[PDB]
Amino acid sequence: MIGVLTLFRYSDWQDKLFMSLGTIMAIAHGSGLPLMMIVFGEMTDKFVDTAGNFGKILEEEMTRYAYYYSGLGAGVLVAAYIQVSFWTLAAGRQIRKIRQKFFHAILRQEIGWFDINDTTELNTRLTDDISKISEGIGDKVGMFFQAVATFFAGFIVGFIRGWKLTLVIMAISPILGLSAAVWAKILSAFSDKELAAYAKAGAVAEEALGAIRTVIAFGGQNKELERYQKHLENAKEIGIKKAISANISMGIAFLLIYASYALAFWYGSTLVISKEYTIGNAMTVFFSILIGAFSVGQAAPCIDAFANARGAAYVIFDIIDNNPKIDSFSERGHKPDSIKGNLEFNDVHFSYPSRANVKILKGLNLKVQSGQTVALVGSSGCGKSTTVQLIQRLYDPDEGTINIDGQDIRNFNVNYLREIIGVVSQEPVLFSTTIAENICYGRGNVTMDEIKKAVKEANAYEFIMKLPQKFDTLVGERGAQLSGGQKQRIAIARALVRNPKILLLDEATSALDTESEAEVQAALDKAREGRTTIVIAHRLSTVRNADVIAGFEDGVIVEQGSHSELMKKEGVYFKLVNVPPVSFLKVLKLNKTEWPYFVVGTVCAIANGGLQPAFSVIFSEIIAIFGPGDDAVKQQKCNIFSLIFLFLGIISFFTFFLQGFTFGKAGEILTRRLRSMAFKAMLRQDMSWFDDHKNSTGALSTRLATDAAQVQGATGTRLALIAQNIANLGTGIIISFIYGWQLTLLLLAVVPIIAVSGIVEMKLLAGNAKRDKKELEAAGKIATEAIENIRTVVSLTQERKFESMYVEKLYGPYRNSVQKAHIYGITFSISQAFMYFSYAGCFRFGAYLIVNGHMRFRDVILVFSAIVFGAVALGHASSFAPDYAKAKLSAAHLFMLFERQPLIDSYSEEGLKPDKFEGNITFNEVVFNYPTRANVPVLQGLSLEVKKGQTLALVGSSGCGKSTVVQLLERFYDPLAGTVLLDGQEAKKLNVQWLRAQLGIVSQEPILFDCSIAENIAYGDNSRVVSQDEIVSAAKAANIHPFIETLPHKYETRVGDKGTQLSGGQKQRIAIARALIRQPQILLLDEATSALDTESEKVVQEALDKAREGRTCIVIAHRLSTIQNADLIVVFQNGRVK
């Protein structure tokens, strides 16, 4: 939180002018209610007197009062317009300045700052918190000021027309204030009604639905739905008392409102029988002051909004005002004119800003000569993009030096540094633009001639020029409408048009084939003239095109020198060379286990929308018992009415408590059902559904933790909202039509123009809502683009282009907001001012009626108030609502998530259950290419089989079908060109659950939930209790009890999320057990033990051959120390079995 006078610091002279004039006409919108009263006082006295003596002088006097009314209504037309308009405009300027400068400093801010933050958070922030601040500074403040204005105006205008009554009433005033403040905090705080309690269960509905492999691999889809319950329950356990609290508080709040009207009516009915005041005069005081403190009550949601703002703007303004050390946009430093590619890395030390505990550079010695190449190569995935992101200063080796031409890398300007170097990124890193405009991102000023020179200067012609309109055919998001060779190679041309002085490669041509290499390695090594190139190689094809060979070893460089002189040196490369809708009826049937709650709740609601016609008939009587004569019996009736008010006080205590508590617990019921139903039927799918982007981890979790609550709303909150607003305008329209229909008609005419201001002040999107969602997404697409793939933007130093596109797309939300402000100021002002013109025309027509015989003032003041305030009440109730038609989309989503039938339905008994699964597979010509990555073949012709009790192992390149065959035997997917059958019998006929009982797996990446370790390791067999000694037998078996006996909490400590409260060596041998519980048959230790030191591991294959007998084994591991106990041998060659 930052304080009232810093959240406004982005205001220009004309802003302060809009705010100041919007504030003085806020204050002058305010005092418009009291003066309406003052004339209401004098017209009440005129009516009661004149009709009491029996005269069209009444009509001409009511005329003059109609002018005072209309005049004040036009005054409020103008002052409401100016209030809302200028306040929204001042927020528009301030918020686009905040937005532009936010983006500017979200790019200027470092990269490690994106080790800290994830980009879903950041895009929420940039589209959610900015609209929080827009709410805060936008218009909340103008209506807050108009509230406090009319408060003081009622105060001051009671005093000036009676001071006793004003004192007795200003006495209770805190009561009506705090009361309307709670009645108006409730009908908002419902919609959200969430702090951080659900999170106790959401933690597991998220972490254990993002680790959905280990949760399918082991049948454990009940030890993750049960626990989900046993936290939803313990959330219910407090949600109950808190619904009790909220509804007792609203019951009280109306008990105090009605006690207040009773006190005030007694007192101010004694002062009017000793003739001190008058009917009108007494009204003026109470009504001015009551609506004063009611309108100060009902601005508790606005005083909440302003603080939501202040608390968002704290974190936005602090993101902005940081000056990250390595300043992209800075001019600090020197820039030379003659630069050579003599690069050196000496005693550098870069520890990560997130995970500083994995040290990967521990004192280097790397030297290069101007022009000639190098060779930075090593084992698979050994952290070498480090070198590709430490020179362009994305990060900083803290205690070292990156020497370029006798200088350190820091005293160079960064905007000039990252300009003289260009790279080819390991995975082709495209910006979502056409080819030509993909390339201009290299230098921003590159014309046709150089485009062609640099696109053919590496043979990048045919595969681009085949498809038409080459430079308007767009290429795909994340690499979606182009291939692995048509896309990758282009990353040489762009980062060439830069005309570099050094160029770099992170395995530029890993997925570039032989003839592709024979047409690229020319541009690759004809590149050098006097400039360096830093090679990170994968193959052994052109590493020989070098004079230097620098190896990777324990974070310390070891080998260097020429090829022949080093063939005797015994280095490291020495080894390398050898949605459908769903009706109302269906969302209502979703919970028919509560007919009683909806019945009691809805009859309560019908007995709360009827308090308004109650008031209407009550002070229809009051205007008749306060006539002339009989002053002795006039004090009797007013005491009966003090009483009546008290009794409805207590009734509505009980009616409001019931209504609330009833629909609150029915909502909670429906919510817990929907949550657990969705989560069950969301562990019941294949993994051909949980890899997509329509179904992320946070997408699913969003649907759980938000669409449940919203369908909860839309089921029966609408039932109430309709029952009230039927018994409230319905009953009032009915009564009004019984008593006087002519004036009722004239007021129905206006009802739509009065019940709009209440919904506008907290709607502000009517012909704009979907519009806002559209224009802001279409302008933030660039935000998202440059915000996700940001190593490249910040690596090309091609961010100012993205910034300026951002700006010129913001120019759309800006004229949107301007026409928004102006048409919404107009609708708000005309609704408001039509209230006063309502008083005027209604009472003029009324006085005509009265002097015609067609009515009687007691009835004109029944009708007027019944209808006008059924209207304002419809406003207040409607504008306090959860957006039914929003959560009907939640309804449709949830339903479609229920019904889907996964062809790998794990929750089915249909199938064949053999008894002794002999540890045999039978793979007759199996093939499978990814379903969504539809074409890249990971398995293009294979055939295997293991024998019962034998061992085998597969070794090769990065991911060449080592794992993607496991997803075929675990039967996540059904292979399309092939036929899987186990033990000689075919799979698809097998029961799928049984199938995942005999089959054991362990993980190259073993992961554990947020639980103790009584359960965590027992997981491996649900459908039977896992004993205690079973867990410890495994612990000695898995060779983890050699270290288990250290934990102060031996077997019951609370471990974190998916390898958090563990180490890199520990978990390598923990998942051993979580499948060794079922006593499976087929072991798949896919590098399950890789980070265990040599001292602790090899013993793993001792308790796993004196027991491994009686069952088979498959292996995927790069451990030459154990590969050599094979029986059958099958090898990768181009993803084929030779």
Epitope: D337, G444, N445
Partner: antibody
């Protein structure tokens, strides 16, 4: 401007010892925040004489000594048309006015003047 | 200004036009070719590099603060005038150049 030049004819007219015009450099085809519009004076029988240098993306100006003081260059990134007011016209002020583009987001080109404009002759006679 | 070495003479020489800077400034210069009555074009930038679409008989280099264009072996295809603009200062001046032709 990506494959062409979009600088259009700008402020065409004549001047006598009693005249003055509002010359423009009516660019197009790019975003004024990527450039810094310039002007030069090219008087008959003499070499090129630069006059002004405005960088709209900082609202800056590095003035000369010839038209010093008496001029003002004021670029309008909204309407995509800069404006130099040819006021205080003497006789020496006559020239073909090359006004052009100047890429500011690539440091290697430290002299700008990527392109060059054909010029709308200021013609001061009597 | 520069030292104009205006040359239009017998064929078969490497006419190398030079440019001296108005003050001691780094290699921020540009050499334009003008056909008197038209709009110039750039041929080298940063005093060493090469611009687009120009024919690559043009070349140059830098030593201290002295800059050169070169046209070698005077061909039947030489007629123009030159300008030389020095930069890397808030002030950006120019040069007068030469008037190259052939024949007679």
């Amino acid at each position: 401007e990506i494959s062409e030049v979009q600088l259009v004819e700008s402020g065409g007219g004549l001047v006598q010892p009693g005249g003055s015009l509002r010359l423009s450099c009516a660019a197009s085809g790019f975003n004024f925040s990527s450039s810094s519009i310039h002007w030069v004076r090219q008087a008959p029988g003499k070499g090129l004489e630069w006059v002004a240098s405005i960088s709209s993306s900082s609202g800056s100006t590095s003035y000369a000594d010839s038209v010093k003081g008496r001029f003002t260059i004021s670029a309008d990134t909204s309407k995509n048309t800069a404006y130099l007011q040819m006021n205080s016209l003497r006789a020496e002020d006559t020239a073909v006015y090359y006004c052009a583009r100047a890429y500011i987001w690539w440091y290697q080109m430290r002299q700008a003047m990527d392109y060059w404009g054909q010029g709308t002759l200021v013609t001061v006679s009597s | 200004t520069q030292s104009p070495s205006s040359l239009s003479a017998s064929v078969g020489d490497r006419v190398t036009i030079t440019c001296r800077a108005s003050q001691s400034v780094s290699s921020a210069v540009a050499w334009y070719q003008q056909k008197p009555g038209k709009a110039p074009k750039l041929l080298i930038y940063s005093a060493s590099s090469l611009y687009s679409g120009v024919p690559s008989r043009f070349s140059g280099s830098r030593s201290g603060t002295d800059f050169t264009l070169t046209i070698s072996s005077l061909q039947p295809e030489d007629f123009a005038t030159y300008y030389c603009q020095q930069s890397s200062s808030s002030l950006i001046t120019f040069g007068q150049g030469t008037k190259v032709e052939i024949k007679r």
